[PDB]
Design a protein around this nucleic acid. Structure first.
Ligand code: MG
Ligand code: MG
Ligand code: MG
Ligand code: MG
Ligand code: MG
Ligand code: MG
Ligand code: MG
Ligand code: MG
Ligand code: MG
Ligand code: MG
Ligand code: MG
Ligand code: MG
Ligand code: MG
Ligand code: MG
Ligand code: MG
Ligand code: MG
Ligand code: MG
Ligand code: MG
Ligand code: MG
Ligand code: MG
Ligand code: MG
Lengths: 151, 70, 116
RNA sequence: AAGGCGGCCCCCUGGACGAAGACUGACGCUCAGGUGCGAAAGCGUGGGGAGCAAACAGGAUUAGAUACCCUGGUAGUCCACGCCGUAAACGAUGUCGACUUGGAGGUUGUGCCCUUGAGGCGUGGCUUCCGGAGCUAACGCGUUAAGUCGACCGCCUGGGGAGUACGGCCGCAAGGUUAAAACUCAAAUGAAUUGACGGGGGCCCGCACAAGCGGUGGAGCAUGUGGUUUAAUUCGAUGCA
């Protein structure tokens, strides 16, 4: 968009829990364009996570995002022979979506049986402040303070 | 560019006063112009264009301060 | 040792690096720290923030002398010319004066060639 | 006068301009051959050498890089005395006189009022910018003419060969000055116009980049093409398109 300002069309808050934030989760997780399989996988995975540790089905899943949200991210600008990254803050709207993506891409790399099981395990680690999700958030944080002299 | 910090005040204002001293005394600019040696012709040529374009700005102002534009 | 009460701080800025040396009025060094010496080897040692990191490092490691007053003598117009003294006061010093000493010849020796 | 001349002081010296008068009374302008000065580099004999730096050596980039970039570095740049005598030595505009509407300035004298204090009125000398008539191919010049005229001098006669060869003069040398011919081409050129282009400058765009999702190139197969085979493997389409 050279001359365009956008406004994202709204989406339906999920029926089971009413959180539009969780409704994005099924949209990000959904593959090949189908919600029937993706929505049930998220719901089923949330039952095990909630049963395993702590009440408040939504709040346990919200703790994981609070641990994987990145507060800074680098962007590259080419000047001479080599590009060098410059750090920049993350707007809170994109901040939610970034960690919301990292969990799913890290979940698909476990060796478990069901995608629901892999998602439950990853969300457990994130809520416990461990695993691949926070590790990905750690690199973008470390590599943004690695070269902070640029701005 | 010697500055003497007064009774307390803020260090930022003392720093802003020291920066103003260097700007007013031309410490920054003289180092750059004397880092390399340029030939005497280039010195005479650059001053020629600097004065010519400075006066040309004044002579081009009179052609727009009275002519309606829109 | 000797618990020097007041001291001097020389900032040697340059287009490529920054050196911070803490002394006393007698001109004897106590500790030094440079941007290149602070692990910023490469193209980042000329950044203004790279001088911030080095100034604290030289403010530290001279705590043995108990220095409480500093005079700042900035030199060598470059990137790290004002940031490096913002960090000096953040270390707790009470800067008495700031002076700019820098070699400005009255058309002395001939400088090198233009670059192409 | 041109080349050129930049801390302060001293002592030798040239030129320019202005006010008011005396004085000589055509003593004037130009100048072939001559004579003098003449940037930088260069040469000779002595000194000096901080910094820069041809040559040179190493490190890089590169397909190579005898270059640009980096770290070093000698002649030279500096002084005295002699040679050299060439530059885009250029306002690419010879010197000397006369006349021909105007503006805005810079610098240096001066004689009146209002020594009312700033100021106002003019006359002199150099000098910068813009423009009127006029000039001309157009750019442009335009009272400091490239305008209208006088007096002398130098130079030019298609482009290469060529400011070269030979022969003189000059120089220690580098080389300088004077200076052709055979042969070859139908052009070479100046200014301006319309485009196109730029690793020139602006402003605006779009699945052009950025933010994402899914793919191709890897495998098996379908289909088209190139090639190769064949008695024939019918003809056409061939960057985007
Ligand atoms: Mg250099
Ligand atoms: Mg003659
Ligand atoms: Mg010479
Ligand atoms: Mg010599
Ligand atoms: Mg010698
Ligand atoms: Mg070199
Ligand atoms: Mg000549
Ligand atoms: Mg010649
Ligand atoms: Mg000249
Ligand atoms: Mg000139
Ligand atoms: Mg000529
Ligand atoms: Mg004469
Ligand atoms: Mg004019
Ligand atoms: Mg000759
Ligand atoms: Mg000859
Ligand atoms: Mg992209
Ligand atoms: Mg394939
Ligand atoms: Mg046919
Ligand atoms: Mg065919
Ligand atoms: Mg064909
Ligand atoms: Mg055809």
């Amino acid at each position: 968009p050279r001359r365009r300002v956008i406004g994202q069309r709204k989406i339906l808050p999920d029926p089971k829990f009413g959180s539009e934030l969780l409704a994005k989760f099924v949209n990000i997780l959904m593959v090949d364009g189908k919600k029937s399989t993706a929505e049930s996988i998220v719901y089923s995975a949330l039952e095990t996570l909630a049963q395993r540790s702590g009440k408040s089905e939504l709040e346990a899943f919200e703790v994981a995002l609070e641990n994987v949200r990145p507060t800074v991210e680098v962007k590259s600008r080419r000047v001479g022979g080599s590009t060098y990254q410059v750090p920049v803050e993350v707007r809170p709207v994109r901040r939610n979506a970034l960690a919301m993506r990292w969990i799913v891409e890290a979940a698909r790399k476990r060796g478990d049986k069901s995608m629901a099981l892999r998602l439950a395990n990853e969300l457990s680690d994130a809520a416990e402040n461990k695993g691949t999700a926070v590790k990905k958030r750690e690199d973008v944080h470390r590599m943004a303070e690695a070269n902070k002299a640029f701005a | 560019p010697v500055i003497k910090v007064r009774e307390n005040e803020p260090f930022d204002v003392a720093l802003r006063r020291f920066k103003r001293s260097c700007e007013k005394a031309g410490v920054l600019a003289e180092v750059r112009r004397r880092e390399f040696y340029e030939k005497p012709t280039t010195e005479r040529k650059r001053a020629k264009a600097s004065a010519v374009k400075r006066h040309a700005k004044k002579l081009a102002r009179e052609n727009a301060r009275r002519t309606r534009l829109y | 040792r000797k618990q020097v009460s007041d001291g001097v701080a020389h900032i040697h800025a340059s287009f490529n690096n920054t050196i911070v040396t803490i002394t006393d009025r007698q001109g004897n060094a106590l500790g030094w720290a440079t941007a290149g010496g602070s692990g910023f080897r490469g193209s980042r040692k000329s950044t203004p923030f790279a001088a911030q990191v080095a100034a604290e490092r030289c403010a530290d490691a001279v705590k043995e002398y108990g220095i409480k007053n500093l005079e700042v003598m900035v030199k060598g117009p470059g990137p790290g010319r004002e940031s490096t003294i913002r960090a000096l006061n953040a270390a707790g010093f009470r800067i008495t004066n700031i002076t700019d000493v820098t070699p400005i010849p009255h058309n002395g020796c001939r400088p090198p060639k233009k670059r192409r």
